[model samples]
Target: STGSATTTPIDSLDDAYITPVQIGTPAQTLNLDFDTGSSDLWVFSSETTASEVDGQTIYTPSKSTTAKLLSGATWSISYGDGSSSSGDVYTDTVSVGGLTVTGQAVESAKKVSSSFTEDSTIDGLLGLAFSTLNTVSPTQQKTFFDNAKASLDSPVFTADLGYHAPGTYNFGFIDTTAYTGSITYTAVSTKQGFWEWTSTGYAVGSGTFKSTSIDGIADTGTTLLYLPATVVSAYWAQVSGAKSSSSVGGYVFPCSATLPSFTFGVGSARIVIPGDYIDFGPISTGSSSCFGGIQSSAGIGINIFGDVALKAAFVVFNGATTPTLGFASK
Candidate 1:
């Protein structure tokens, strides 16, 4: 089961997507879809059909006097998540968090599919998370991190908020004191796109995983963390009254009692996910409280620890400088 981002009332962004950005010359306002599953930052614009866009903002070339299209060249990219957007590239004077950068890369998808065509919330995506789903031809496109490196107030970009699509989200500069302990850094694997990582295995309490060894990716675009069946069952056994049911994907578990602290060892760096994160909403379909962590996609694809786990910690991806990934407490 893939976890979805939480949508709340107080949003640092507008609409369901589009993280706010402040950019050059008379302040051009734009939206960005912050996706972690891939590393492409795309926005919508006048070329984008207003009729086909959903829960997003569409930048108006008419609105921004300084907007410039890349020779009217068009581009398209499809992601593993089944959602897609197609549009032309536009370079414009833009700003985020008061830092202005002009001549920056931006995409304005003209023909968005039906799913994205409906909601009129934010204008476009930030494509902030790590992913390999970009269409940049040279095979090397500098994401927001690459472009903002020279302007950031600190050496690192730290994100510490638990946000859904339209909630309060802060990117760049982590408030380390908001979390506990020394931040541990994980070397970024050369694997392309998304913040791909090697999960050693699953464990309950403090015990090691039995009969199961897992290696996979962790994506923020996805809402929940997924594990193999054996490992899922093992994990549910620890919580008081936790029970499992067979679903179309695999199985899901719910319990009222608090769960033990679980940690996944990525090499020597220990990332721990607390129990409260495992309990999302108050109830399931009927009376059962919605359990946060779910099990699905067994024998289908590689294991994925989605955003649920990511929201509980501070993560940073180094698109530049040898591509390193790091995680800290939040």
Candidate 2:
């Protein structure tokens, strides 16, 4: 049987998608962010300092008969946005939708950074990237997908993230009814533990596609689309009154400005990002300036095709032989 979970966006086209997950034997349920950018299934737990726990529902291993400690094991992770979490380890039965994985490494967070403590909605993160990226020290951990793949009829999962609406993530099988037209496939290199690939070119609005090669990752965790600096500049140049603001940390334009669509080439397929999705809400509360959802990769090095870009299409993250990425219009 295939597993599926409904994903809800915290804000209107703003942040990562949150999905329901059950952990431990008695099934302590929590809302988790399914992130394709990193590997490590960690949660705010009983081990966390009470003050640091904030508004999250902590996972209590002591209450679960199936929970077992991984002696001397610990895990820590720091994200590109500087958010961080570190915790001890436990092996327990973790369930997503209807799929179950026994003895899965469940990192119990004892410490969390300000970014996490303040954002009370995200209980934890379920990494969909490669198992090699697991942050557990001494002994690394496998993601829920990796551990459950063997039981799956096909080692694959499809992310159908929707724009400002509830979406579904399907495992073990691809549901054709969720997407239309033919699926375009591309070979992926996971040497960096991310679903990394190269885009043949890009274009702003209806402009001719340039042949400039771009190397990036398909990340569901990141909220915005991050492109190279040169590309970002070219994109915003087409929009009047758009400028990079140090106070805002990215390109921003007048809220009334008409934005243009952006397109990225994948093999022969051109995944077009709609103009409306590029305008990421206002730069600040009650501000007339709005931030562009597409920003410069700059220090991040690799471009990120985050939710803004991913939601424009149906993405299949294949764990089968050769590791390929399949994309189709939704």
Candidate 3:
């Protein structure tokens, strides 16, 4: 990671998000996670008939007297995780806590069918990382984040991880109490959106990266980490030969012993992942020898970090200072 104090408002995925300006009203209580990954600030609208925006909070004209639509502008966003939606851009008065952001850039989905409506836990997404990955740009627009960076009060936006809680994004200010402050900090790279670092391998419970089968990309859009096959196969090899009789699918290796620690080297810094974070449940398959971290890439397109990775570190995307998200061990 490059060492720089100044930061950008882009998220770990490198997508850029507009602050209060494009989002309409600052008073709108939109969560920040929507702005981090997928680049569309979508809320339900009366215009959308029965269609659902999964995990998205509905935008009711009655709740917000100021939400306004961009008549000619249409919007859509797609992600590597098989998530997608289409809608129109709108500006609304958003109020978050005591602070209010005016003219926030948001999307009003025209079509949001499937599990997307049933699975979504948040209201919408505001693209805050890369300019190239935005869904609305190629067809009909400039990203909401790029349009509103300068006006954000802090300018630099940050993500601090804690135990998983539903609807906790955009709460404002990372709670210091959650972390021990013994974190390792890395600088940002020159590239605006990518969290670029060099890591050769890792290990867990006497197994190294080759063994634990760590396969995944530290992606901005991804909220979790998906393991690769090679590492998973190698991890099963290390378990005690006697206890290996039972095995679960997706690489679940049964070992009653406490898991070991693993290390990863990025650039010049060394990162150590504790056992608790790596110890996932039994493998999806029936075999107990191979753990599930050696998951199925069947439907997954890229090895991106999903929610699993975000829970381990404090991510700070400061598009205001520069176009980069700073990573630190949390």
In terms of TM-score, the best-performing candidate is: 2
TM-score of 3: 0.66
lDDT of each: 0.58, 0.91, 0.47
- Per-residue accuracy of model 1 over 11-48 as CA lDDT, tens digit each: 33111234566433466565555666666667666677
- Candidate 2: clashing pairs of residues: none
For residues 74-154, write the lDDT of model 2, one tens digit per residue: 999999998899989999999898999999999999999998898788999999999999999999989999999989979
Estimated TM-score for each candidate: 0.76, 0.98, 0.66
Q: What is the C-alpha local distance difference test score of candidate 3?
A: 0.47
Better of 2 and 3 by TM-score: 2
Question: Candidate 1 vs candidate 2: which has greater TM-score?
Answer: 2
Candidate 3 backbone clash number: 99
Candidate order by decreasing TM-score: 2, 1, 3
Q: Which residue ranges in model 1 land beyond 4 Å of their true spot?
A: 1-18, 23-25, 28-31, 118-122, 129-133, 136-141, 151-155, 163-174, 205-214, 237-250, 254-261, 280-292, 297-300
lDDT of 3 by residue, 29-132 (tens): 43334445444566655556574544454565545567675667777666664566777776675543333445656677677656457644444555555555
